[PDB]
Design a protein around this ligand. Structure first.
Ligand SMILES: Cc1oc(-c2ccccc2)nc1CCc1nc(-c2ccccc2)cn1C
Ligand SMILES: [Mg+2]
Ligand SMILES: [Zn+2]
Length: 313
C-alpha cells in the first residue's frame, strides 16, 4: 500500500509534459505506466500484484513489428496520462482507470497490417469482424487477458461499475479506428460551434473520449522533431511491408505503402498533418483548452516537414 514507484529526477519532471519520450530502455516502461496509474488514479485503484501481472501479459501479447508494438502502447498511454493530468476535474474515477488501460491495450496482437490488407487477404478476422477488424480483435484480446486467473485488475469494482469500465474501454479502442475519426470530429466540430456540446450527455462524452483516443494514438506527431522523424521510419517500414504483401496478392498498393515512392513521404506527411493531425488537435484544444501544447507541437512538426520539402533538410 505504501510502495510508490519513483523515477529519476529528469523522468519525474518530463513525464508530466505532453512531448515526453519514454526512452529506449524497455525494462523501465512497466514502471513508467504504474507510476502514471498511481498519480492519475491513486495507489489504491488496482492491486499492485494483479496490475503488474496484467501489464506483463499485455506486453507479451504485443508483437515485434516496427511500429504497432509495446513501445507504441506505452507511448499512447503516456499521452492519455498527460491529457487526464491537465484536465483533473473533467473525468470520473472510472474514466481515469479505464482510459489508461484502454490506451495500453488498444493495439493488442497487432500484426503490422491495416484492416484493408486483412480484407483483401481474406484473413479469418475479416470474416469474424466486417468493420474495425483489428480494433474489435484488440478489445477481444483485452477481455481474454482480463479473464486470466489473477489478471482481473477490476475485480473490486461493483457489477455495474465493472460493466461501465468495460464499455468505456470497448468504445475507446473501437474509436482508434481512424476510418471512424473523420465523422466523429465533424460531429464534435458542429456541436462545439452551434453550442450544443454537453459533457453531462453520455453520447457527447463518448465522442470526446473518442477524439482523445485519436489524439493519443497520433501523438508521435506531437514530439520533438527528432522523435517524430525517427518514428515516421517505423510507420513507413510497416506500410511498405504491407505494400509488398499487396503486390504479392497482385494488387498495386496506394503510393503510401509503395516503397518505390519513398521520395513522396514529406508531401504524404504534409497531407496527413493537414487532413488528420491538425484538425484532430484543433477540435481537441477547443473542447479541452489545456491540451493546446499538442496542437502547438503538431504545428511545429508540420513546419519541419515543410522545411524537408524545400530541401532545407
Ligand atoms: C496514415 C499515416 O499515419 C501516419 C502517422 C504519422 C504519425 C503518427 C501516426 C500516424 N503517417 C501516415 C502516412 C501519411 C501519408 N503518406 C503518404 C505517402 C507517403 C509516401 C509516398 C506517397 C504517399 C500518404 N499519406 C496519407
Ligand atoms: Mg490501432
Ligand atoms: Zn495505435
Amino acid at each position: 500500500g505504501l510502495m510508490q514507484f519513483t523515477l529519476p529526477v529528469r523522468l519525474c519532471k518530463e513525464i508530466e509534459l505532453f512531448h515526453f519520450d519514454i526512452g529506449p530502455f524497455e525494462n523501465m516502461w512497466p514502471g513508467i505506466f504504474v507510476y502514471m496509474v498511481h498519480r492519475s488514479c491513486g495507489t489504491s485503484c488496482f492491486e499492485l500484484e494483479k496490475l503488474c501481472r496484467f501489464i506483463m501479459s499485455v506486453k507479451k501479447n504485443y508483437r515485434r513489428v516496427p511500429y504497432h508494438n509495446w513501445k507504441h502502447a506505452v507511448t499512447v498511454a503516456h499521452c492519455m496520462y498527460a491529457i487526464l493530468q491537465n484536465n483533473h476535474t473533467l473525468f470520473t474515477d472510472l474514466e481515469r482507470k479505464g482510459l489508461l488501460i484502454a490506451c495500453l491495450c488498444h493495439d493488442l496482437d497487432h500484426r503490422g497490417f491495416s484492416n484493408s490488407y486483412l480484407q483483401k487477404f481474406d484473413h479469418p478476422l475479416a470474416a469474424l469482424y466486417s468493420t474495425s477488424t483489428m480494433e474489435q480483435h484488440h478489445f477481444s484480446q483485452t477481455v481474454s487477458i482480463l479473464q486470466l486467473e489473477g489478471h482481473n485488475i477490476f475485480s473490486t469494482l461493483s457489477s455495474s461499475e465493472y460493466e461501465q469500465v468495460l464499455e468505456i474501454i470497448r468504445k475507446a479502442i473501437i474509436a482508434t479506428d481512424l476510418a471512424l475519426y473523420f465523422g466523429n470530429r465533424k460531429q464534435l466540430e458542429e456541436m462545439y460551434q452551434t453550442g450544443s456540446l454537453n459533457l453531462n450527455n453520455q453520447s457527447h462524452r463518448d465522442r470526446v473520449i473518442g477524439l482523445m483516443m485519436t489524439a493519443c494514438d497520433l501523438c508521435s506527431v506531437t514530439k520533438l522533431w527528432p522523435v517524430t522523424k525517427l518514428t515516421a521510419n517505423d510507420i513507413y517500414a510497416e506500410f511498405w511491408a504491407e505494400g509488398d504483401e499487396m503486390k504479392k496478392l497482385g494488387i498495386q498498393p496506394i503510393p503510401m505503402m509503395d516503397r518505390d515512392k519513398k521520395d513522396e513521404v514529406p508531401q504524404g506527411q504534409l497531407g496527413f498533418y493537414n487532413a488528420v493531425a491538425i484538425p484532430c488537435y484543433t477540435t481537441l484544444t477547443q473542447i479541452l483548452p489545456p491540451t493546446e501544447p499538442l496542437l502547438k507541437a503538431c504545428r511545429d512538426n508540420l513546419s519541419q516537414w515543410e522545411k524537408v520539402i524545400r530541401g532545407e533538410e
